[PDB]
Amino acid sequence: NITDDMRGELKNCSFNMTTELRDKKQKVYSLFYRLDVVQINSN
Amino acid sequence: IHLENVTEEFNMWKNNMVEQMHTDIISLWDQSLKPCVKLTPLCVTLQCTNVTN
Amino acid sequence: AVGIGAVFLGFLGAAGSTMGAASMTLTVQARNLLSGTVWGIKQLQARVLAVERYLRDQQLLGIWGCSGKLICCTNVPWNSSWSNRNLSEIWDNMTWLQWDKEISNYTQIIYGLLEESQNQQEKNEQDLLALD
Numbered sequence: 463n464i465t466d467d468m469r470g471e472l473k474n475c476s477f478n479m480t481t482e483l484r485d486k487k488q489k490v491y492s493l494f495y496r497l498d499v500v501q502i503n504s505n
Numbered sequence: 506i507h508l509e510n511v512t513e514e515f516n517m518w519k520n521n522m523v524e525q526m527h528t529d530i531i532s533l534w535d536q537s538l539k540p541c542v543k544l545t546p547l548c549v550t551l552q553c554t555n556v557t558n
Numbered sequence: 559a560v561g562i563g564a565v566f567l568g569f570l571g572a573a574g575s576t577m578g579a580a581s582m583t584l585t586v587q588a589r590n591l592l593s594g595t596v597w598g599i600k601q602l603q604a605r606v607l608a609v610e611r612y613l614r615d616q617q618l619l620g621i622w623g624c625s626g627k628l629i630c631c632t633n634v635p636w637n638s639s640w641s642n643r644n645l646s647e648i649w650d651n652m653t654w655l656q657w658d659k660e661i662s663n664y665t666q667i668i669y670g671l672l673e674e675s676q677n678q679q680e681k682n683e684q685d686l687l688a689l690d
């Protein structure tokens with residue numbers, strides 16, 4: 463339940479991760495804090 | 506040199522220095538691998554068929 | 559008690575001989591006691607353990623009467639409660655490997671008496687020089 467005045471301190475981040483095989487990559491998600499990720503400059 | 510009129514009790518099972526030789530040969534086996542080549546790029550999909558036979 | 563013989567007479571050669579006969583070869587075990595990318599640390603700590611043990615033994619000698627005699631006599635008498643056996647049945651009967659076990663319990667009682675007698679003899683010598 464997002465409150466627009468406050469901020470969520472967790473971001474649900476999905477990304478490509480390399481698998482144990484050097485051919486195939488997978489898509490995996492994780493949870494990070496606001497203090498560990500920064501937005502690079504829609505999407 | 507030979508020792509006359511002496512008697513010591515031995516035990517190969519509670520002996521030391523088989524532990525030392527085991528540890529040293531394991532570690533010395535490991536230390537001849539640090540200059541060598543890791544097969545990181547070879548973990549890859551292998552399309553395998555039978556040998557020509 | 560030494561004679562003419564051509565054999566090598568080496569380190570721990572008279573370990574099984576009686577202790578009146580291994581005493582005639584004590585400079586051999588005294589001689590062969592000191593000189594002998596990661597493994598240099600193991601060799602190096604073995605060498606410093608060797609010189610540390612040699613220094614500890616020479617320090618135990620040096621705070622007693624003899625510092626380089628290798629056979630020395632002192633002024634504490636043999637308490638007969640320690641070994642209660644004759645003089646003839648040690649120097650002609652037993653070995654140092656067998657005499658080590660028989661006074662291992664009474665060891666460290668003797669060493670304090672050795673230091674005590676040497677400190678008392680040092681202060682008696684200092685007073686005897688001082689009265690002159």
Ligand SMILES: *[C@@H]1O[C@H](CO)[C@@H](O[C@@H]2O[C@H](CO)[C@@H](O)[C@H](O)[C@H]2NC(C)=O)[C@H](O)[C@H]1NC(C)=O
Nearest residue numbers: 463464465466467468469470471472473501505
């Ligand atoms: C998702 O997160 C974004 C931030 O990346 C939120 O966008 C702003 O959030 C702040 C505080 O959370 C609000 O004060 C702003 O008004 C939001 N911007 C807009 C344009 O509304 C966003 O609200 C979050 N929630 C959703 C459902 O997208």
Ligand SMILES: *[C@@H]1O[C@H](CO)[C@@H](O[C@@H]2O[C@H](CO)[C@@H](O)[C@H](O)[C@H]2NC(C)=O)[C@H](O)[C@H]1NC(C)=O
Nearest residue numbers: 474475476477478479487488489490491492505
């Ligand atoms: C994971 O990898 C996939 C594929 O490499 C990425 O999906 C592409 O995203 C771009 C930008 O939106 C599209 O133009 C491509 O068409 C997409 N390709 C496919 C196969 O879907 C994806 O962005 C990566 N990241 C995540 C979080 O999934």
Ligand SMILES: *[C@@H]1O[C@H](CO)[C@@H](O[C@@H]2O[C@H](CO)[C@@H](O)[C@H](O)[C@H]2NC(C)=O)[C@H](O)[C@H]1NC(C)=O
Nearest residue numbers: 485547548549550551552553554555556557558
């Ligand atoms: C292993 O498989 C390879 C194919 O990947 C074989 O190589 C081919 O052999 C044919 C038959 O002589 C030649 O015409 C091709 O030019 C070869 N290709 C390459 C890239 O060398 C190979 O002979 C097989 N070996 C065994 C032992 O089965």
Ligand SMILES: *[C@@H]1O[C@H](CO)[C@@H](O)[C@H](O)[C@H]1NC(C)=O
Nearest residue numbers: 640641659660661662663664
């Ligand atoms: C030293 O103590 C042990 C254990 O009490 C004993 O058996 C042994 O006889 C003692 N040593 C001597 C020389 O009596």
